[PDB]
Amino acid sequence: GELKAIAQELKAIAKELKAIAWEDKAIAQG
């Protein structure tokens, strides 16, 4: 169903934001 697909896509979004957070941490640390 589409609500589950939406939940799954939000999970993917959370994962990409976690990647952004880590890269921004690396910029900050530098």
In the complex, the residues that contact a copy of itself under the rule CB under 8 A are 1-7, 9-14, 16-21, 23-30
Distance of alpha carbon 13 from alpha carbon 19, whole angstroms: 10
Could you count the other beta carbons within 10 Å of the beta carbon of residue 3?
7
| Shortest separation between residue 3's beta carbon and Na ion, angstroms | 27
- Cα dihedral: 13, 19, 21, 5 (round 10): 10
1/30 with CB nearer Na ion: 30
| Shortest separation between residue 8's beta carbon and a copy of itself, angstroms | 8
| Shortest separation between residue 27's beta carbon and Na ion, angstroms | 8
